[PDB]
């Protein structure tokens, strides 16, 4: 179902696409697993921890 | 935008974020397609069908 | 939290041991920005003199 | 004929704070516990998405 | 001011009065209007001095010039405030009080000196019964108790001579009227007559206590308390809280209660109170004194303010939150900070990144100093404001303040030595401290958001000793072993390994390059990959015989990545090491070789270069993980179908009624284990190759390039369990309480799981998590104990001149060699060189450091065992020397004088357990299964070489070992011991001696169910004292005549067959006796109890079995979380449940009288006429039937052995080696490399006590425990003077007993059991002249170790000079 949903949105079924480095501009050997995620953070403030 | 570390991911016996990243990529592709279809004023019926 | 792009790939040492390397657009677009409220109370007490 | 009762769903064992994970069966018990803790101790952002 | 020693003794009342400068009478603290203390209160200004800084009470005496002027109105001596800190008060009591902790503390020293139980003195002190002090008449004498009625009955008869008081007064009068010399003489006269063990030990302890009390100069009247001291007011502060309220102290309330009770007692005595009221008031005063000294331990504690009871001085001294382990050992320190970690090198190895603020708040004194130096600021007060304004010149000066300045980094907790390192900071942005990437394994702190501690040394001494000693460049090895501590993570390093790999013959292969720089250019230009099989013109350099370099250039078949890695390697390492794949162990060996060959300076540069190269090439590689990477073999479904079909067949067989519960359970377990093994093998076969690609026509088979398989082969973490759990079958789970679960999990994390399997694995995951979380504290307690035990080790002399040692032969566990001789004797000093004929009788020098060349020579010569100078076999007094320890594992060279030996070893032994319990369990947790039953198989090919064997050819023509202790060895052509197994008595072997064996041949037949008796010559059996009904019985069996005769024990014998011992006489066909070949005793084997005879008279019996199986399994549990109690009991000298009783004296051993079935083992030596009888229980199994010519320390009974009896019987070296091996096997099972020197150090520190049973000249009697250094000095003096010596007996003690037996009572009290140690020091009157390191730590002086060795030798030579 994940591959079908990827194919629906005109995306490769493998879910792994190669990237370009923002420093030299070289192409990597193996593709990279990229995508959107939902990140969270605790309080853990360096202004208070330090 | 964010670059994670693939070192400790396969050792902690959990796929998790990999499937979440693939599903997020699918959702982002669907959203980009919707945005591209919305930037034009072709037909509302086509948007409904999509 | 917030939805952001994430890629699984090594780097020059910014993803050494399960760390998180972020970009500048995250800070420019005010993403992951909170607001703290620190209480400061000044009390007035009379002394014995 | 040996079936007596049936459960309602699969989310009856795990509470919300630990079942909010999109993929729970693909994680370890300790990993899911740490994720539930990091999620229940999260902090809101400026623009909620 | 510099004190030499710390003395502890009893305080005198007049001395306590002289200590104070006034008496406290009223308990008033302050007034509700003014906060001025009352003129007779607790912290009055007249008694303890002024409150403010040089100011009187009424505020009249201003003009601080007036010093020492007593006022006429208030009477306050104008002095400073710190006067109250170093002064105390006193309280004048009306009635004397007995010190609670002098009789409540074990072993009730008051009752020992008075020869009276604790209950009696308790009834006397609490005014329950009266005691007679001294009776002049012949009716009663001293120490006679009379109740209330008995006292009245005895008082009406006589008068003016019956001396009796109540409690404290009576005890004081008894202590005053008693004479110590007369009692000592009486005890010494009584001990010479009788020798009852309990009474003799009691009188000996009493004489020791009396002698200590006499030599200490204390008085028995000082035991009572008439004037007690008062705590200084500064130690019990009374300041108003910020919330407008007052904060009182519980000690103030206790003192107020004591003063109120004393005032009530005085008012009652001045008004002639009745007897009952006086007794009640005295009991209340005693209870108050008790609660002030030790609040609520013998009864109910005094109720505190709200709900919790008050804490007294005993709680402040004994408790965990006491002063000792909170303000002396470790406490808050100025110029410190805590910060968050950062993930980025951004620097070099010996440098770290710090935010501007850390020096913003810590380097401000240096900022002000160098501001006053150049004069850029006017004053310090203006410089502070200029810094608070954050000017640019402030940061410009701070850049020079931070220029070449050390700084200490810390991670809590600090287990090993690498937890405290020093670096130099550089100002950066972002307020989180950066950490070095390679010190992640040193601090044992992953980058998950931990907190680091930053400290700043101020003195040039500390700065230099932090720059030199604790630098990451100088301290690169682990203190546990000689291996580099850098065993890295980083799939970055996995990508380095990938660079060291090969691939397909795709575009880029088929050229030749001249050097590594050409390959680097070709790879950086974007022309080919780093896998092309390209011959490179490598110019390699090898060291010369003297130290020079040898240049040689040749072509090498390699790849581009390997050429780049060789380019990173400097011109000091060969090429044959990098020619293979570089994994974890490979790079570890490379680093070890670079350290041992080049040194220490270029290794840091090499590590920095290789880590930068790895980071760069990993960023350029771009690895990733995806669902499509982890493939699942299609045979897994077929395996699951076969497994479920077999389970259905098992269920159908169980429903028929043919398989029990245990058999079905074991069969299901075995079937599922085989299925999991097949699934794992299929997964490996599917994931290994994955290389179906045409290679210039024909195909080629190689390894795959999947991220999971690559990460597993490179060794990022290293686990196949995670592989099989992620791709194949998870495995078998165990029930939370009972056993292993029958139904395992079939799915995996790739296809998803259900609720059942998740819930059934969660209770095991959290079980393991709780186990490791609770064992992380037991490990810390074990580290605490090990540090407390071995703490007084200092290197005083280079050598001690001892030739005795232990031949350390390589212990080969089973067949495979676990630890060879090279990895065992690396870094040890050899003595008493044994001449072993090898190639051409190679001689080994004496007292030489074993280098790698010597190790190679020993490997070429194949030396069996080498004797070295062990730590236990040392001779230097007050610690050990440098020749008995060997090469240091920190610097790489021979250790000099000053460096500690005990603390380092304790930390190195304690850190691996905690590290493993924190690392392995936090990543993954499950349960495994171990095998119990073994088989007979010999894989190695060699020859049979017996040792200490007395075998004889039997009638069957085979060699059967006729001895008890015989180990079957396997000698090879090279002349070394490879295999060694325990051969039981009566094992039928296959070959003899010297014959060559093959692989997979049954060498012995040690059947646990059949242990036959070895018979040499056949003969007719004659029944001797074997009558049916008297000793034996008849039991009808089901066979065709094969009956069974059971020899009943003495518990069922008749009155006539008591001494009739049954035996088996072997005669000929006519009736003549048969003598044993070699001796004069005829053939007669006495059958032990519960003997089973198979054949009756008329037919000769053979292969008699009169034993059972009784399977008992020893320890050897799973990971350290479940094995910590084992090593804990090992280091505590614990007694096993079944101690193996060994032979005391060699000779003829026989039996004796047996009452109730208890066996008696009489030892009748051939030289000693006095017999030695031993008590053996009835249920204890014996090996021998009557007795053999055993030696000193022969295994008589089965089961585990006790280390206390081995040390006393066999020897000290034997038990030392046994303990070392037993402790090292635990780490061998867990895969931990720890040298035996760290264990031998603790063994020697546990054997520092011994008893003396002789008649000597100095103060040494029978049954005294003296320090080993003292008895060594005494033996030296006796040998130098020529007097009669004394023979000592070394005894083994645990951690607690050896710690309490230390002469340094300060450290022993600071560790644990402070109050009892303090009481022992006060009663005995010891002398502690700053021996232990904890003393110097508390008093804050130079440590008598390390850098302070010069100060220690200077103070020693000054004390010796005068």
Curated annotation (Swiss-Prot), chain D:
Description of post-translational modifications: Acetylated on several lysine residues in the presence of glucose.
Biotech and industrial use: Co-administration of salinamide and rifampicin or salinamide and myxopyronin suppresses the emergence of resistance to both antibiotics.
Impact upon substituting residue 30 to H/K: Resistant to antibiotics salinamide A and B
Effect recorded for residue 18 to E: Resistant to antibiotics salinamide A and B
Phenotypic consequence of residue 28 to A/G: Resistant to antibiotics salinamide A and B
Family recorded in the similarity comment: Belongs to the RNA polymerase beta chain family.
Subunit composition and interactions: The RNAP catalytic core consists of 2 alpha, 1 beta, 1 beta' and 1 omega subunit. When a sigma factor is associated with the core the holoenzyme is formed, which can initiate transcription. The rRNA transcription and antitermination complex (rrnTAC) consists of RNAP, NusA, NusB, NusE (rpsJ), NusG, SubB, ribosomal protein S4, DNA and precursor rRNA; S4 is more flexible than other subunits. In pull-down experiments interacts with CedA. (Microbial infection) Interacts (via flap domain) with Escherichia phage lambda antitermination protein Q; this interaction renders bacterial RNAP resistant to transcription pausing and allows it to read through termination signals.
Primary role: DNA-dependent RNA polymerase (RNAP) catalyzes the transcription of DNA into RNA using the four ribonucleoside triphosphates as substrates. Resistance to the antibiotics salinamide A, salinamide B, rifampicin, streptolydigin, CBR703, myxopyronin, and lipiarmycin can result from mutations in this protein.
Name of the protein this chain belongs to: DNA-directed RNA polymerase subunit beta
Organism of origin: Escherichia coli (strain K12)
Lineage of the species this protein comes from: Bacteria, Pseudomonadati, Pseudomonadota, Gammaproteobacteria, Enterobacterales
From Swiss-Prot, chain E:
Pfam families, per database record: RNA_pol_Rpb1_1, RNA_pol_Rpb1_2, RNA_pol_Rpb1_3, RNA_pol_Rpb1_4, RNA_pol_Rpb1_5
Result after altering residue 721 to T: Resistant to antibiotics salinamide A and B
Binding site for Zn(2+) 2: 800, 874, 881, 884
Cofactor(s), names only, from the UniProt record: Mg(2+); Zn(2+)
Cellular component GO terms, alphabetical: cytoplasm; cytosol; cytosolic DNA-directed RNA polymerase complex; membrane; transcription elongation factor complex
Consequence of changing residue 749 to C: Resistant to antibiotics salinamide A and B
Catalytic activity, reaction form: RNA(n) + a ribonucleoside 5'-triphosphate = RNA(n+1) + diphosphate
Keyword annotations from UniProtKB, A to Z: Acetylation, Antibiotic resistance, DNA-directed RNA polymerase, Magnesium, Metal-binding, Nucleotidyltransferase, Transcription, Transferase, Zinc
Positions bound to Mg(2+): 446, 448, 450
One BP term from GO: bacterial-type flagellum assembly
EC number: 2.7.7.6
A GO MF term: zinc ion binding
Application in biotechnology: Co-administration of salinamide and rifampicin or salinamide and myxopyronin suppresses the emergence of resistance to both antibiotics.
Impact when changing residue 765 to T/V: Resistant to antibiotics salinamide A and B
SMART domains referenced in this protein's UniProt entry, alphabetically: RPOLA_N (SM00663)
Superkingdom of origin organism: Bacteria
SUPFAM superfamilies: beta and beta-prime subunits of DNA dependent RNA-polymerase (SSF64484)
The UniProt record lists the keyword Transcription: yes
CDD domains per UniProt: RNAP_beta'_C, RNAP_beta'_N
Binding site for Zn(2+) 1: 56, 58, 71, 74
Modified residues (N6-acetyllysine): 969
Enzyme class, UniProt record, top EC level: transferase
Protein name: DNA-directed RNA polymerase subunit beta'
Natural source organism: Escherichia coli (strain K12)
Taxonomic lineage from the root: Bacteria, Pseudomonadati, Pseudomonadota, Gammaproteobacteria, Enterobacterales
């Amino acid at each position: 179902e994940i591959k079908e949903l990827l194919k629906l949105g005109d995306l490769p079924t493998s879910g792994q696409i190669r990237l370009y480095d923002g420093r030299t501009g070289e192409q990597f050997e193996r593709p990279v697993t990229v995508g959107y995620m939902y990140m969270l953070k605790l309080n853990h403030l360096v202004d208070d921890k330090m | 935008d964010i670059v994670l570390n693939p070192l400790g991911v396969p050792s902690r016996m959990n796929i998790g974020q990999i499937l979440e990243t693939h599903l997020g990529m699918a959702a982002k592709g669907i959203g980009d397609k919707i945005n591209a279809m919305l930037k034009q004023q072709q037909e509302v019926a086509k948007l409904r069908e999509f | 939290g917030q939805n952001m792009r994430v890629a699984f790939m090594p780097w020059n040492g910014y993803n050494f041991e399960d760390s998180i390397l972020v970009s500048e657009r995250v800070v420019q677009e005010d993403r992951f920005t909170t607001i703290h409220i620190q209480e400061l109370a000044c009390v007035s007490r009379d002394t014995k003199l | 004929d040996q079936v007596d009762y049936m459960d309602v769903s699969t989310q009856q064992v795990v509470s919300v704070g630990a079942s909010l994970i999109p993929f729970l069966e693909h994680d370890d018990a300790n990993r899911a516990l740490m994720g539930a803790n990091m999620q229940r101790q999260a902090v809101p952002t400026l623009r909620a998405d | 001011e510099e004190f030499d020693a710390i003395k502890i003794a009893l305080a005198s009342p007049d001395m306590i009065r002289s200590w104070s400068f006034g008496e406290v009478k009223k308990p008033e603290t302050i007034n509700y209007r003014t906060f001025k203390p009352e003129r007779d209160g607790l912290f009055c200004a007249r008694i303890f001095g002024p409150v403010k800084d040089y100011e009187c009470l009424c505020g009249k005496y201003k003009r601080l010039k007036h010093r020492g002027v007593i006022c006429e109105k208030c009477g306050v001596e104008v002095t400073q405030t710190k006067v109250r800190r170093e002064r105390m008060g006193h309280i004048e009591l009306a009635s004397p009080t007995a010190h609670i902790w002098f009789l409540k503390s074990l072993p009730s020293r008051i009752g020992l000196l008075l020869d009276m139980p604790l209950r009696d003195i308790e009834r006397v002190l609490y005014f329950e019964s009266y005691v007679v002090i001294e009776g002049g008449m012949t009716n009663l004498e001293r120490q006679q108790i009379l109740t209330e009625e008995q006292y009245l009955d005895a008082l009406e008869e006589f008068g003016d001579e019956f001396d009796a008081k109540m409690g404290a007064e009576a005890i004081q009068a008894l202590l005053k009227s008693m004479d110590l010399e007369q009692e000592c003489e009486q005890l010494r006269e009584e001990l010479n007559e009788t020798n009852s063990e309990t009474k003799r030990k009691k009188l000996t302890k009493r004489i020791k206590l009396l002698e200590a009390f006499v030599q200490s100069g204390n008085k028995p009247e000082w035991m009572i308390l008439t004037v007690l001291p008062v705590l200084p007011p500064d130690l019990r502060p009374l300041v108003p809280l910020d919330g407008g309220r007052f904060a009182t102290s519980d000690l103030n309330d206790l003192y107020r209660r004591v003063i109120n009770r004393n005032n009530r007692l005085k008012r009652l005595l001045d008004l002639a109170a009745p007897d009952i009221i006086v007794r009640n008031e005295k009991r209340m005063l005693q209870e108050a004194v008790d609660a002030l000294l030790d609040n609520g331990r013998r009864g109910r504690a005094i109720t505190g303010s709200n709900k919790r009871p008050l804490k007294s001085l005993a709680d402040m001294i004994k408790g965990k939150q006491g002063r000792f382990r909170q303000n002396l050992l470790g406490k808050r320190v100025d110029y410190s900070g805590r910060s968050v970690i950062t993930v980025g090198p951004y620097l070099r190895l010996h440098q770290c990144g710090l935010p501007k603020k850390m020096a913003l708040e810590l380097f401000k004194p240096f900022i002000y100093g160098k501001l006053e130096l150049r004069g850029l600021a006017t004053t310090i007060k203006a410089a502070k404001k200029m810094v608070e304004r954050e000017e640019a010149v402030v940061w410009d000066i701070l850049d020079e303040v931070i220029r070449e300045h050390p700084v200490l980094l810390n991670r809590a907790p600090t287990l090993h030595r690498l937890g405290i390192q020093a670096f130099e900071p550089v100002l950066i942005e972002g307020k989180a401290i950066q950490l070095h990437p390679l010190v992640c394994a040193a601090y044992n702190a992953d980058f998950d958001g931990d907190q680091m501690a930053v400290h700043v040394p101020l003195t040039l001494e500390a700065q230099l000793e932090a720059r030199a000693l604790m630098m990451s460049t100088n301290n690169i090895l682990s203190p546990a072993n000689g291996e580099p501590i850098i065993v890295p993570s980083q799939d970055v390093v996995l990508g380095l390994y990938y660079m060291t790999r090969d691939c397909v013959n795709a575009k880029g292969e088929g050229m030749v390059l001249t050097g590594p720089k050409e390959a680097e250019r070709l790879y950086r230009s974007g022309l080919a990959s780093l896998h092309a099989r390209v011959k490179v013109r490598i110019t390699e350099y090898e060291k010369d015989a003297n130290g020079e370099l040898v240049a040689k250039t040749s072509l090498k078949d390699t790849t581009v990545g390997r050429a780049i890695l060789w380019m990173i390697v400097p011109k000091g390492l060969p090429y044959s090491i990098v020619n293979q794949a570089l994994g974890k162990k490979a790079i570890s060996k490379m680093l070890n070789t670079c350290y041992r060959i080049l040194g220490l300076k270029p290794t840091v540069i090499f590590a920095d270069q290789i880590m930068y190269t790895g980071f760069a090439y990993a960023a350029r590689s771009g690895a990733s993980v995806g669902i499509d990477d982890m493939v699942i073999p299609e045979k897994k479904h077929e395996i699951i179908s076969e497994a479920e079909a077999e389970v259905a067949e098992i269920q159908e067989q169980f429903q028929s009624g043919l398989v029990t519960a245990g058999e079905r359970y074991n069969k299901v377990i075995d079937i599922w284990a085989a299925a999991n093994d097949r699934v794992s093998k299929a997964m490996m076969d599917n994931l290994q190759t994955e290389t179906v690609i045409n290679r210039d026509g024909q195909e080629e088979k190689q390894v795959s390039f999947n991220s999971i398989y690559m990460m597993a082969d490179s060794g990022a973490r290293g686990s196949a369990a995670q592989i099989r759990q992620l791709a194949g079958m998870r495995g078998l789970m165990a029930k939370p309480d009972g056993s292993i679960i029958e139904t395992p999990i079939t799915a995996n994390f790739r296809e998803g799981l259900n609720v059942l399997q998740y819930f059934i694995s969660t209770h095991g995951a959290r079980k393991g998590l709780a186990d490791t979380a609770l064992k992380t504290a037991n490990s810390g307690y074990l580290t605490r104990r090990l540090v407390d035990v071995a703490q007084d080790l200092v290197v005083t002399e280079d050598d001690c001149g001892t030739h005795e040692g232990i031949m350390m032969t390589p212990v080969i566990e089973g067949g495979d060699v676990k630890e060879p001789l090279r990895d065992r004797v690396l870094g040890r000093v050899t003595a008493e060189d044994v001449l072993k004929p090898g190639t051409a009788d190679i001689l080994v020098p004496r007292n030489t450091l074993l280098h790698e060349q010597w190790c190679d020579l020993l490997e070429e010569n194949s030396v069996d065992a080498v004797k070295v100078r062990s730590v236990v076999s040392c001779d230097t007094d007050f610690g050990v020397c440098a020749h008995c320890y060997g090469r240091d594992l920190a610097r790489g060279h021979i250790i000099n004088k000053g460096e500690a030996i005990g603390v380092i070893a304790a930390q190195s032994i304690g850190e691996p357990g905690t590290q493993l319990t924190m690392r392995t369990f936090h990543i993954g947790g499950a349960a495994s299964r171990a095998a119990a039953e073994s088989s007979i198989q010999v894989k190695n090919k060699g020859s049979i070489k017996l040792s200490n064997v007395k075998s004889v050819v039997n009638s069957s023509g085979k060699l059967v070992i006729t001895s008890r202790n015989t180990e079957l060895k396997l000698i090879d052509e090279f002349g070394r011991t490879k295999e060694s197994y325990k051969v039981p008595y009566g094992a039928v072997l296959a070959k003899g001696d010297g014959e060559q064996v093959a692989g997979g041949e049954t060498v012995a037949n040690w059947d646990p169910h059949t242990m036959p008796v070895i018979t040499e010559v056949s003969g007719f059996v004659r029944f001797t004292d074997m009558i049916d009904g008297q000793t034996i019985t008849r039991q009808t069996d089901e066979l065709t005549g094969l009956s069974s005769l059971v020899v009943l024990d003495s518990a069922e014998r008749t009155a006539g067959g008591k001494d009739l011992r049954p035996a088996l006489k072997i005669v000929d066909a006519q009736g003549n006796d048969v003598l044993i070949p070699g001796t004069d005793m005829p053939a007669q084997y006495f059958l032990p109890g519960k003997a089973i005879v198979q054949l009756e008279d008329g037919v000769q019996i053979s292969s008699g079995d009169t034993l059972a199986r009784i399977p008992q399994e020893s320890g050897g549990t799973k990971d350290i979380t479940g094995g910590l109690p084992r090593v804990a009991d090992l280091f505590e000298a614990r007694r096993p449940k079944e101690p193996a009783i060994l032979a005391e004296i060699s000779g003829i051993v026989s039996f004796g009288k047996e009452t109730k079935g208890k066996r008696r083992l009489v030892i009748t030596p051939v030289d000693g006429s006095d017999p030695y009888e031993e008590m053996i229980p009835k249920w204890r199994q014996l090996n021998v039937f009557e007795g053999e010519r055993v030696e000193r320390g022969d295994v008589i009974s089965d089961g585990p052995e006790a280390p206390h009896d081995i040390l006393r019987l066999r020897g000290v070296h034997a038990v030392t080696r046994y303990i070392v091996n037993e402790v090292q096997d635990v780490y061998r099972l867990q895969g931990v490399k720890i040298n035996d020197k760290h264990i031998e150090v603790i063994v020697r520190q546990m054997l520092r006590k011994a008893t003396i049973v002789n008649a000597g000249s100095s103060d040494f009697l029978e049954g005294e425990q003296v320090e080993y250094s003292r008895v060594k000095i005494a033996n030296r003096e006796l040998e130098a003077n020529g007097k009669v010596g004394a023979t000592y007996s070394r005894d083994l003690l645990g951690i607690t007993k050896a710690s309490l037996a230390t002469e340094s009572f300060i450290s022993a009290a600071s560790f644990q059991e402070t109050t009892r140690v303090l009481t022992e020091a006060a009663v005995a009157g010891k002398r502690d002249e700053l021996r232990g390191l904890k003393e110097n730590v508390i008093v804050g002086r130079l440590i008598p170790a390390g850098t302070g060795y010069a100060y220690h030798q200077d103070r020693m030579r000054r004390r010796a000079a005068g």
